[model samples]
Target: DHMQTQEIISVTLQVLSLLPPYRQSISVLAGSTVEDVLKKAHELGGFTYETQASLSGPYLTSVMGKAAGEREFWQLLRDPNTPLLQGIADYRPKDGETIELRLVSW
Candidate 1:
């Protein structure tokens, strides 16, 4: 039997709560970057640099390389060398658009 670990739970909650909200407000035509989402998160005061720092460590390790902070993780997501950056390389957001991050459960 496979057990759901605490790390999995934590990551799931974090992504579910944050990514969806950002996606909902993301503008497809306006062009959006990971940085823009970070700024919006900061502006809303829903997340802090410290919080991002915390999440970055685990998330980056699981998704890509290790990132020192949120910016680093964002950069990695957009980096051409990264696999996740393929289709999103030229991705842009619209004036008042958002993205819906589809979550999958194993």
Candidate 2:
């Protein structure tokens, strides 16, 4: 059965994986929303963040020690090809889903 029985049970099925497009799925997490996932990954990946206020709204100047390029941006995606419309802090991810961070040219 799919149950872990005993005096108590603990389940760690949720995953936080990444993709590079050129190759490979990254992670496989505190994770109800994108921020939560990011924070969780940060603990694991040695990441840093620099936040700023923009006319468009909030912005991510960096991720994984990589800053946003002049013509490039940090794009977040979910499995099956759905792009998030909100800022990373606003996009809440679902349970049992896959998320990705890719560099894109604007």
Candidate 3:
């Protein structure tokens, strides 16, 4: 049996409450991490981001061309709520899940 299937997962990525807000539904290969998804989104054109290497992974410094102010950073949300515990390089979103990038103060 030669059955080959390419798994494609659909998820929504959004920038919430900053820079007029941006949202996009993207289809990515199964097992693609958040970093991969964001890279795809960047190539497709909508927003931009910058990252710095951290002990865990790439740390998000800015989103949508706006760097976070002092005491503020881009927050990763795994939906409307529920902040992600893992870094973008490590988190793989499930199909139909929504990931949000928000700028917030500590």
Candidate 4:
């Protein structure tokens, strides 16, 4: 049967770069981890940056040219008051959740 159907789950990914003071965001299919959104961002290639992740945890080294410092890191947030406890890879946001990757200092 050529009849095919698909279910779509989407989430909004927001970014706040501390270095240059800029904000950006995008929408991605849910179910996968936050890195999937990041991969979508990487595909755009409009902004040049780098990221490093390992067994220790997933780390967004930099975004929009804003790199993390020895004492600073990207803060995962569902909201200003709702900070994500687990790593991006460890959580799957719901359909209406707004995922944020904000650069913050320690």
Output the number of the TM-score-best candidate: 3
For 1-106, candidate 1 gives per-residue lDDT tens digits of: 5533322111111233233233223211134444445445446554433223342231322221222433333222222223343222233333333332322333
List TM-score per model, in order: 0.30, 0.61, 0.89, 0.72
lDDT of 4 by residue, 15-46 (tens): 75544443435446647677776676567656
* Cα lDDT, all candidates: 0.31, 0.54, 0.87, 0.67
| Residues 4-75, model 3: lDDT tens digits | 353888779998767588999987899998888889899888768899997877999988888888999898
Model 2 misplaced regions, further than 4 Å: 1-31, 45-49, 54-57
Provide the lDDT at 36 for model 3. Answer: 84
Per-residue lDDT, model 2, residue 75, is 70
The clash number for model 3 is 0
Stretches off by above 4 angstroms in model 3 are: 1-6
Write down the lDDT that model 3 would get: 0.87
lDDT against true structure, model 1: 0.31
Candidate 3 accuracy as TM-score: 0.89
- lDDT tens digits by residue: candidate 2, 1-106: 6533322221121222223222222232323456555665565554445557888666766665667768987777777666778876777655445666666777
Model 1, 12: alpha-carbon shift in Å?
A: 20
Candidate 4 pairs with clashing backbones? none
Candidate 2 least-lDDT 10 residues:
6-15
